Design a protein around this ligand. Structure first.
Ligand SMILES: *[C@@H]1O[C@H](CO)[C@@H](O)[C@H](O)[C@H]1NC(C)=O
Ligand SMILES: *[C@@H]1O[C@H](CO)[C@@H](O)[C@H](O)[C@H]1NC(C)=O
Ligand SMILES: *[C@@H]1O[C@H](CO)[C@@H](O)[C@H](O)[C@H]1NC(C)=O
Length: 133
């Protein structure tokens, strides 16, 4: 269970307890590499580095982000003060920009970053992309 500002899974502020990922291969512009899968993700994550600091809000082309079906945010990012928000993540595959979908949580944080709660993936090979733009 999570609330407006804290996640209880005891309760903590996601902006102060997340996993930091600096993985440029996650970029929506990276179409290379051996496809991997974010099946092992759990809890809250922050993305930094040249691959970008945010999930894409637009459908990503297949075979990007070092995966087969790249996953993007079927929603709009929250602002600081909006609390933890409920969103759908969509995987693009086989002509279908939401071939698979799963729930993700998003929170805006003091200091100008977002954190994402990512609980595995619905299929493999799927990954949560970052937009370097
Ligand atoms: C951070 O989150 C992890 C997993 O949710 C938990 O095991 C750990 O106790 C948390 N730490 C703090 C300080 O909240
Ligand atoms: C998700 O994407 C579809 C198609 O691109 C769009 O119609 C819908 O409004 C989007 N939902 C949100 C919450 O952004
Ligand atoms: C997010 O919203 C969906 C649709 O209302 C719901 O099924 C899901 O349980 C929500 N996630 C939560 C409350 O963590």
């Amino acid at each position: 269970s999570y609330g407006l500002d804290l996640d209880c899974g005891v309760c903590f502020d996601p902006c102060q307890n997340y996993t930091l990922l600096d993985e440029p291969f996650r970029s929506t512009e990276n179409s290379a590499g051996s496809q991997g899968c974010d099946k092992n993700m759990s809890g809250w994550y922050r993305f930094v580095g040249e691959g970008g600091v945010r999930m894409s809000e637009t459908c990503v082309q297949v075979h990007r982000c070092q995966t087969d079906a790249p996953m993007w945010l079927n929603g709009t990012h929250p602002a600081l003060g909006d609390g933890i928000t409920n969103h759908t993540a969509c995987a693009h595959w086989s002509g279908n920009c939401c071939f698979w979908k799963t729930e993700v949580l998003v929170k805006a944080c003091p200091g100008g970053y977002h954190v994402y709660r990512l609980e595995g993936t619905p299929w493999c090979n799927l990954r949560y992309c970052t937009d370097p733009s």
